[PDB]
Amino acid sequence: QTKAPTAEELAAAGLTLTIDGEVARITLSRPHRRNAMTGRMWTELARIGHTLPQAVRIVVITGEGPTFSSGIDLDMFQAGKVDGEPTPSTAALDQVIASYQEGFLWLRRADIVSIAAVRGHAIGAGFQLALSCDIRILSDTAQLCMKEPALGLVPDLTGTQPLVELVGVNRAIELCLTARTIDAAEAAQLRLAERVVADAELDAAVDALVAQLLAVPAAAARATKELLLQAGRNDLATQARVERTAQLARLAELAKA
Amino acid sequence: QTKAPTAEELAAAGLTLTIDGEVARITLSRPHRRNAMTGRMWTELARIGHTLPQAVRIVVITGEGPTFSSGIDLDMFQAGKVDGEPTPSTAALDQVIASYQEGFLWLRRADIVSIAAVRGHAIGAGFQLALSCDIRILSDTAQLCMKEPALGLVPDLTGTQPLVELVGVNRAIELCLTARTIDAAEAAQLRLAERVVADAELDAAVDALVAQLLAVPAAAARATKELLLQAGRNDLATQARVERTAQLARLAELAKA
Amino acid sequence: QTKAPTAEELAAAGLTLTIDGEVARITLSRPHRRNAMTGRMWTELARIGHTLPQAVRIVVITGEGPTFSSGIDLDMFQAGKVDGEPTPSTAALDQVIASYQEGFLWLRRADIVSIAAVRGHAIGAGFQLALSCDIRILSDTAQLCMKEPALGLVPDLTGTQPLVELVGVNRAIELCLTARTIDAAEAAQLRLAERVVADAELDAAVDALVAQLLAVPAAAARATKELLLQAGRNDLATQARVERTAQLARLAELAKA
Fold this sequence. Notes:
3 copies of one chain form a homotrimer. By secondary structure, chain A is α/β, with parallel strands linked by helices. The first copy, chain A, folds into 2 domains: 1-216, 2-enoyl-CoA Hydratase, Chain A, domain 1, CATH 3.90.226; 217-257, Orthogonal Bundle (Lyase 2-enoyl-coa Hydratase, Chain  A, domain 2), CATH 1.10.12.10. Chain A has helices at 7-12, 39-51, 90-105, 125-132, 160-178, 184-189, 202-214, 218-231, 236-256; strands at residues 15-20, 23-28, 58-63, 113-118, 121-123, 135-139, 143-145, 181-183, 195-197. In chain A, a hairpin with a 2-residue loop joins strand 1 and strand 2 (23-28). In chain A, helix 2 (39-51) crosses helix 3 and helix 8 packs antiparallel against helix 9 (236-256). Chains in contact: A-B, A-C, B-C. The A-C interface holds A 113, 134-136, 162, 165-166, 191, 194, 209, 212-213, 215-217, 219-221, 223-225, 227-229, 231-237, 239-240, 243-248, 250-252, 254 and C 88, 90, 93-94, 97-98, 101, 105, 108, 148-158, 160-161, 163-165, 168-174, 176-180, 232-233. Chains A, B, C: Acetyl-CoA binds at residues 34, 70, 73-74. Chains A, B, C: Pathway: Lipid metabolism; fatty acid beta-oxidation. Chains A, B, C: Pfam families: ECH_1.
């Protein structure tokens, strides 16, 4: 919108947002349903993204309760409304899915560092939300599962690309085509978690990471993330040119100050 | 061909094929030569690929005996016929090598999951065959070696791309330009094996993986593999579009049933 | 130049070069400043690259003393000359940075295998130098840090691409946007080191790697490195074609001998 979602509107969609200076914390807030996700949840995540204050540069996504997210609410695969919105002509459906994917795409923005702090299960859409973030910090209780193929579906919430980046195509095939669940130890071995900590220490681990990030100047953090996101698809000559162009802008700003 | 290779024809090329419903098992069957590969073997692997029944969605490649494959039969580097076929103008040679590479390229098909179950040495062409599969399960006896450069040759049986995907360019350079042999522990550390099991347990490990794969519906498995194979080279916007296009086709099929 | 830099010229830039047959050893030689790098150092590294004898196929980069490199000399961020050269219109600056990046780009050449042998800290530009090499062998004393963002700068000495290749985009974001220091154990876990050895064993480990590399014929090593560098950005069909084209050239040369 132009208007940021209100706390009341977010509560109706199963979310909480708090902002403290440069840090925004989004909490999945349907513990009674193990933070199962709905269309409304996804479109409100997109609206949070589109309306975040310019000063926010770090976004932490957490769940309430012991489970990060059990994935799509199973009510979404029936006729009636969910979270007040009507569930899932082909063009229409395509537009709807695109609208949901917007809730995950913004987590890649160069001007934020997005962090998923995952306890318990992150299943399907929930795994994809965690994959969509820059960084994952897992509790030792975390369990990850790309469940969609077991349901007859593909992963369509933008998780395929980060999965392949993290684990390689071959392991991605094995995880997705078995739809198996992996524990935090395995997740760490496969580079799916940047850090694994004891459950009781997850909030402190997130806070420590946030403090490290805040200590690096915002503009250099943003420029560097933008460079890193381009590096895999550019040839080396091109990437060197992109790097130097970015450095010229940093030097120009530092000269102004 | 139109016609699948017969068991007799395959035996003359050093191979066995058995099909049981949705699963095909190809066994390299020259244990007396440590499953060294020949031109005939490669072109018959291509013909198996081209003629597989539509119902087959899983392909397991194994060796007979303690060695997966010692790589190219050293008789291939002389004048006389091998396996009845004449060994390796420049255009002709190029066509011949292309014909051999077809024996490995089909293992990437989206409609199959290919699994290499590797005991003992997988050298050169043998390593490349294992690399060409989606998944590798290694015995604790497995030893892998990209030998070609030590012989004055390059890897030309399609192994370079999967190697780089699995281990990264830098480690790939180190493994290939030293032509060193690595053991199963190292192979697991480097992501070259998805699983390492005791030698006596390799058949059971393959069966367990096959059972997991069969439990996921075929059409969703195929669509998801197709998505995963595209993810590395697409930008994120494009991959999101590809994902949603694939989901629309899944939803349309699920609606028909 | 046409002329290789002299030992005297290199000493003035903080470097030593020795060549013994097929192996060149470049040593960063300002231990009193912890091998901090300067513009002159970078441009002389480029000149070493451009003038290396054709017979050199292996390049080892080491530091004198306990620290590989503390990164850019802090004198480079002031008015006066450094190493006799004047420090860092926008076009001019762009040309200057491009000239420095040439000191790192040549380490990717297909006709060499470049090896960084790292003790102690490799910070910023120093980390990027190590990243620019094909292979890193670390002492157990090694500490790596992408410091630039903490200084308000981006990494612009060509390190972004190898970093992302080695560790994946997500971990690269975490390392760069925290500007944190990692130890050799972590570096090994993240694939930043191909090998980690005890400090006293680093020279022997480098020598052992050099011996393995020399045992593989030069032309096959060069062709294979060239193939590996292309594999990530090519589709599989294309890479198979590139591989076979390269094999035809190997077979033609082997037939001549």
